[PDB]
């Protein structure tokens, strides 16, 4: 499956980041073999037709284009990062850093809310968007 077209070329991915400016660009640097990236792709497909009018999500393979995993240092098996009009917005997840999500978010509503908040912060220009979630914990009990 993986209906989201993965930008094979690194320069193609960079141009795609420079392609759209009025919406949210999310790149899934996870390798499609691992099950975690499969769950991330499933979550994206859940929000494929929802956040489409406000965002443009693309997949990525760190093996295909390695420059993204060597310059941005995306060492996680499946890290979700955002870039808005040549500005990598930071989501205030609270996991020590804000460059990636790094978690296999199995909740479609949580992903949709995060996308909406990221879009609102990008519109407001805040480079560090306050994520409306307590991602610092496992959020399970």
């Amino acid at each position: 499956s993986y209906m989201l077209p993965h930008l094979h070329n690194g320069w193609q991915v960079d141009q795609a980041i420079l392609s759209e400016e009025d919406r949210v660009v999310v790149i899934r640097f996870g390798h499609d073999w691992d099950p975690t990236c499969m769950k991330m792709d499933e979550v994206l497909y859940s929000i494929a037709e929802k956040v489409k009018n406000f965002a443009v999500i693309y997949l990525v393979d760190i093996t295909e284009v390695p420059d993204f995993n060597k310059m941005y240092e995306l060492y996680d098996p499946c890290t979700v990062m955002f870039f808005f009009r040549n500005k990598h917005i930071m989501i205030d997840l609270g996991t020590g850093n804000n460059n990636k999500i790094n978690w296999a978010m199995e909740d479609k509503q949580e992903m949709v809310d995060i996308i909406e908040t990221v879009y609102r912060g990008a519109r407001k220009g805040r480079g560090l968007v306050v994520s409306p979630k307590d991602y610092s914990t496992k959020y399970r009990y």
Partner: peptide, 13 residues
């Protein structure tokens, strides 16, 4: 299109 990528991913898993 997506068929080739899906087949490639399946063949490695």
């Amino acid at each position: 299109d997506i068929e080739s990528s899906l087949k490639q991913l399946a063949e490695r898993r």
